[PDB]
Design an enzyme around this catalytic site. Structure first.
Site, mmCIF file in Angstrom:
data_model
loop_
_atom_site.group_PDB
_atom_site.id
_atom_site.type_symbol
_atom_site.label_atom_id
_atom_site.label_comp_id
_atom_site.label_asym_id
_atom_site.label_seq_id
_atom_site.Cartn_x
_atom_site.Cartn_y
_atom_site.Cartn_z
ATOM 1 N N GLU A 11 0.831 -1.247 -0.059
ATOM 2 C CA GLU A 11 0.077 -0.143 -0.119
ATOM 3 C C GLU A 11 0.929 1.358 -0.032
ATOM 4 O O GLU A 11 0.298 2.312 -0.324
ATOM 5 C CB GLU A 11 -1.021 0.068 1.220
ATOM 6 C CG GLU A 11 -2.009 -1.360 1.108
ATOM 7 C CD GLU A 11 -3.133 -1.141 0.111
ATOM 8 O OE1 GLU A 11 -3.962 -2.093 -0.039
ATOM 9 O OE2 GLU A 11 -3.252 0.221 -0.561
ATOM 10 N N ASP A 20 -6.267 6.397 -4.926
ATOM 11 C CA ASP A 20 -5.747 5.097 -4.943
ATOM 12 C C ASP A 20 -5.711 4.530 -6.383
ATOM 13 O O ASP A 20 -6.203 5.228 -7.259
ATOM 14 C CB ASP A 20 -6.321 4.050 -4.230
ATOM 15 C CG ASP A 20 -7.742 3.778 -4.482
ATOM 16 O OD1 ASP A 20 -8.549 3.144 -3.694
ATOM 17 O OD2 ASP A 20 -8.159 4.222 -5.528
HETATM 18 K K LIG Z 1 -2.021 2.606 -1.990
#
Ligand SMILES: [K+]
Ligand SMILES: [Cl-]
Ligand SMILES: [Cl-]
Length: 164
Positions: A11, A20
């Site tokens: 992440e 994202d």
């Molecule tokens: K991310």
């Protein structure tokens, strides 16, 4: 390697609101803020999440606090889901982390729908499960990350994260 380290690698860490892979406002270590196209909306969620008027920037400590909460929540969701719990309970620690990873990424509901893969996993049919897992939007949209997770389910080792 552990679930935290694993997810931190998958992440990243960003202290300012960003979008994202799906185009949704997020911050920190993969902390999804909202699927809304409104930045303001995102800022509002952030503030609520952190407990202060932030104006889209947080500290590392703050990021880690949401991360801890998010990992905890993921595990909690797995243990509460009738479809997931049994699989989770049947797995070794490494593999369990791979399932948590998926849940953090897609949510309880999303992973719970991988019916066939779940079954292969519970049967301990590693290679087959891996093949099956790859037949998904998830794999197509985030192939490197998915590959990592899949390798983890396939092998029960952290080889895919080794050296990242
Ligand atoms: K991310
Ligand atoms: Cl939150
Ligand atoms: Cl990817």
């Amino acid at each position: 390697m552990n679930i935290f380290e694993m997810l931190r690698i998958d992440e990243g860490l960003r202290l300012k609101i960003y979008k994202d892979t799906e185009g949704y406002y997020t911050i920190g270590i993969g902390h999804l803020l909202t699927k809304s196209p409104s930045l303001n909306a995102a800022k509002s969620e952030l503030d609520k999440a952190i407990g202060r008027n932030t104006n889209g920037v947080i500290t590392k400590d703050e990021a880690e606090k949401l991360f801890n909460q998010d990992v905890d929540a993921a595990v909690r969701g797995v243990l509460r889901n009738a479809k997931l719990k049994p699989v989770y309970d049947s797995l070794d620690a490494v593999r369990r982390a791979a399932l948590i990873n998926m849940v953090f990424q897609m949510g309880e509901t999303g992973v719970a729908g991988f019916t066939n893969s779940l079954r292969m996993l519970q049967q301990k049919r590693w290679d087959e499960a891996a093949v099956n897992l790859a037949k998904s939007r998830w794999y197509n949209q985030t192939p490197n990350r998915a590959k990592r997770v899949i390798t983890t389910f396939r092998t029960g080792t952290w080889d895919a994260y080794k050296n990242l």
